[PDB]
């Protein structure tokens, strides 16, 4: 066993080793290992992506116009965000500017995804870490109604409703077919909600499972389908026709009316169901404002997103702020440049890839994706990993750094960047939220904070949907219908050699695609995705990524039941297919 110091942590692989493989209630494949000391506190944490597909390799030789459709399949959870980053990257390379309606519709696609991804994550992925579903069977339906009505105006709160939900759960459990609830952590001492809050949360789990299907009808209107809507280089394919013959073949007033109906219902659900439930989880789990801080008080990163000025990716355009903080210095939010070779670099000395020199980091325009499964001694075999060897290569995830710093990305990172850049709406919302919980601002830099920031973002994105829809309708009132630029559609119009960056804030954090075009085909396509940052393995200095840092120093009540590990990992919304691509 060894010990070393990094980023304020003592990384010590003495003591009992715990393995959690598979991690469930995530997208894709992850393994986690920790060591715990004699006080059952984590002194070592190991993040491992256990899948790889090789989209960067598959993209070589494709037509740049097709790339969006391939890279969209990096992930079906954050469906659409890779298509958006792709069309941005190809347009940046060739020099294409899209019409305003295409930009607005792209922003609608991205805000829709934020609402949908954040809502499903809150309930279906993270919720059962916080809600003891089986404890809901002990609740009093009238006290459940009283609790819900004290927290929200939401209509669905009758005692009979909560009794009916409870009875449906009772009949489900009674025959012993517990399905997704089998062999859960129910009754663990870290479950702190009262029975009435568990029944309220479980009822909302079911309401959100139903309602989430409606949100993506917006993607169906503009993008044909969800999951995996369609896009084009040059704008969007959803031609508009409001008042001419043949509007039945296009986005017409009836289609737009459908979109408006979904926006309203989406805001109503997030504002009156998810927001109050997030605040209730905070009220009953305040100690988790001090657990899983990790890198969130050290190093956070946003590229920014939602350009409101078409084809302008600058600070005055992006509605979601970009910037970086390092060394815990929130008074100096630094500018990010995705072309600067000294800024974003990926290391592979602890990952299953070959570089000519594994001690240096490669900017994505110099990126290499040459898979090399080499686990070293794992106390088993190459096909039987009993213990990863975190001293050598231990993951399919590359290790991104920013100016050599290990960063956290995602809702909490973005909230801290916007707050410290002095975004008025963010400062007011964050101060009011932490005031409501009677916690200090520092309480947001935590596993609880990640959950609260995600709910706040769903509300922000539901508001921005209406803003973008109204912008589209204003253009249509002014006779501006254009949805595609085709001046540079044909490959004969492109530069023989060019390169471009497409960037955005996916629901999980900062996303970039780096593309080089030569002779009409993709010569290089490198992706660095939010979970690549967060779930990163170590680098040549031994620096730990966001997940490993957030797990460090965590108390476990019952080593064999990894509820605290799951709470913190799930708070980042791990997307392992994204992370590995």
């Amino acid at each position: 066993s060894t010990q070393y110091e990094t980023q304020g942590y003592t990384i010590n692989n003495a003591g009992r080793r715990l393995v959690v493989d598979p991690i469930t209630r995530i997208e894709g494949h992850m393994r986690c290992e920790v060591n715990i000391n004699d006080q059952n506190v984590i002194t070592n944490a190991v993040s491992c992506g256990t899948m790889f597909r090789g989209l960067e390799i598959i993209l070589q030789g494709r037509d740049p116009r097709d790339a969006w459709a391939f890279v969209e399949r990096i992930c079906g959870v954050c469906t659409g965000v890779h298509a958006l980053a792709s069309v941005y990257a190809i347009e940046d390379a060739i020099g294409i500017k899209v019409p305003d309606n295409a930009n607005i519709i792209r922003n609608i696609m991205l805000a829709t995804l934020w609402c949908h991804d954040h809502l499903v994550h809150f309930y279906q992925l993270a919720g059962m870490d916080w809600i003891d579903v089986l404890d809901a069977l002990k609740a009093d339906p009238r006290k459940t109604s009283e609790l819900a009505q004290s927290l929200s105006s939401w209509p669905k709160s009758s005692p009979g409703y909560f009794f009916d939900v409870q009875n449906r759960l009772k009949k489900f459990v009674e025959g012993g077919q517990l399905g997704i609830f089998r062999n859960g952590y129910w009754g663990h001492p870290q479950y702190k909600l009262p029975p009435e809050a568990n029944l309220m949360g479980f009822a909302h789990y079911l309401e959100a499972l139903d309602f989430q299907r409606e949100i993506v009808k917006i993607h169906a209107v503009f993008g044909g389908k969800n999951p995996h809507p369609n896009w084009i280089v040059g704008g969007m394919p959803c031609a508009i026709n409001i008042d001419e013959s043949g509007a039945v073949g296009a986005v017409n007033m009836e289609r737009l009316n459908l979109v408006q109906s979904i926006i309203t219902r989406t805001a109503d659900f997030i504002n009156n169901v998810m927001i109050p439930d997030a605040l209730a989880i905070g009220q009953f789990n305040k100690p988790w404002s001090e657990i899983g801080t990790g890198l969130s008080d050290k190093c956070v990163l946003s590229y920014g997103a939602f350009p409101d000025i078409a084809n302008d990716f600058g600070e005055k355009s992006l509605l979601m702020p970009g910037g970086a903080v390092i060394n815990g210095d929130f008074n100096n939010v630094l500018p990010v440049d995705l072309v600067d070779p000294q800024q974003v670099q990926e290391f592979v000395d602890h990952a299953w890839y070959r570089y000519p020199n594994d001690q240096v980091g490669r900017h994505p325009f110099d990126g290499i994706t040459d898979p090399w499964y080499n686990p070293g001694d794992v106390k088993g075999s190459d096909t039987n990993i009993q213990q990863l060897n975190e001293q050598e290569r231990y993951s399919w995830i590359k290790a991104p750094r920013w100016r050599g710093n290990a960063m956290e990305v995602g809702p909490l990172a973005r909230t801290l960047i916007a707050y410290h850049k002095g975004d008025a709406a963010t400062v007011e919302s964050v101060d009011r939220m932490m005031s409501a919980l009677n916690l200090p601002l520092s309480g947001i830099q935590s596993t609880l904070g990640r959950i609260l920031c995600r709910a706040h973002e769903a509300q922000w994105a539901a508001g921005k949907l209406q803003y973008f829809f109204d912008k589209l309708m204003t253009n249509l009132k002014n006779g501006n219908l254009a949805t595609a630029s085709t001046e540079k559609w044909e490959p004969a119009t492109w530069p023989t050699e060019c390169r471009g960056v497409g960037f955005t804030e996916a629901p999980k954090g900062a996303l970039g695609h780096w593309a080089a075009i030569r002779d009409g085909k993709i010569d290089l396509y490198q992706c660095v995705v939010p979970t690549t940052w967060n779930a990163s393995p170590r680098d040549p200095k031994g620096q730990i990524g966001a997940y490993e840092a957030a797990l460090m120093n965590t108390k476990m009540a019952i080593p064999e039941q990894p509820l605290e590990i799951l709470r913190t990992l799930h708070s980042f919304d791990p997307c392992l297919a994204c992370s590995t691509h």
């Binding site: 598979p22 991690i23 399949r73 369609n230 297919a577």
Partner: protein
């Protein structure tokens, strides 16, 4: 009355088929899970993780040996001794074969489980392989599409529960009910195809009248699915309705049939 046990496993995939399933409008995925099946294992949705999830897997396949449906999303990679996809420290293919041995029948959800999908597109770095090339002694229903239509997924489940049998299938194992006809044989723009009325460049006057997308690369004429009839997301749209040609995403090898914007 007991519900049919279902074990849902995940190989190399993007999780679009799981997401599609939860979009179901009728029956709601909620009511499928609570009332129609017993979804006894599913990494995306289940409470248990790690050793507790391994216990559920082992208990269900042992207790219900011969009696559960195995749903498979994604595929196994044969490269690097299968360690491009690792499950409890071992190759995913081992968990696939264990789950398959006890199943009464297998549903291969999506083009990944059916054929390969994007990870199998050239040059297939992981040697991603469809389920039927590994599991050769079980009934496999292919439900292709990237992903398949939500209400197609739930209709196939309700058919199997209501009728207590597998759907009848074509020569490739696809349910005849939803894959028996081409997208182009039920496409509402076919009048324009027959009249030579084509979109020639995005957002041209033809595009604004809903003309046919054949010259923009639509692969509807060679693609079998239900998108032009059942449609997507509770009948709201489908690719062609919103102005993009069919990519061909239900067909084996659709990524490597040329550019999506080159004619069928």
């Amino acid at each position: 009355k007991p519900r049919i046990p279902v074990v849902w496993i995940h190989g190399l995939e993007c999780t679009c088929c799981t997401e599609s399933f939860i979009r179901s409008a009728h029956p709601l995925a909620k009511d499928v899970i609570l009332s129609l099946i017993s979804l006894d294992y599913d990494d995306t949705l289940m409470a248990a993780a790690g050793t507790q999830a391994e216990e559920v897997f082992e208990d269900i396949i042992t207790q219900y040996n011969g009696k559960y449906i195995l749903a498979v999303e994604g595929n196994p990679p044969l490269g690097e001794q299968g360690m491009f996809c690792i499950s409890s420290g071992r190759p995913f293919i081992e968990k696939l074969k264990r789950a398959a041995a006890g199943a009464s029948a297998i549903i291969a959800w999506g083009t990944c489980a059916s054929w390969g999908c994007v990870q199998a597109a050239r040059p297939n770095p992981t040697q991603a392989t469809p389920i039927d090339k590994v599991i050769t002694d079980k009934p496999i229903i292919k439900v292709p599409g990237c992903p398949p239509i939500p209400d197609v997924m739930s209709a196939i489940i309700t058919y199997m529960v209501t009728f207590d049998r597998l759907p009848d299938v074509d020569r490739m194992g696809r349910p005849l009910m939803f894959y028996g006809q081409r997208i182009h044989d039920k496409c509402y723009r076919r009048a324009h195809f027959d009249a030579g009325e084509f979109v020639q460049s995005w957002d041209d006057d033809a595009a604004r009248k809903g003309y046919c997308l054949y010259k923009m690369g639509c692969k509807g004429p060679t693609t079998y699915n239900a998108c032009s009839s059942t449609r997507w997301n509770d009948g709201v749209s489908f690719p062609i309705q919103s102005g993009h040609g069919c990519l061909g995403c239900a067909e084996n090898g659709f990524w490597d049939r040329g550019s999506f914007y080159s004619r069928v």
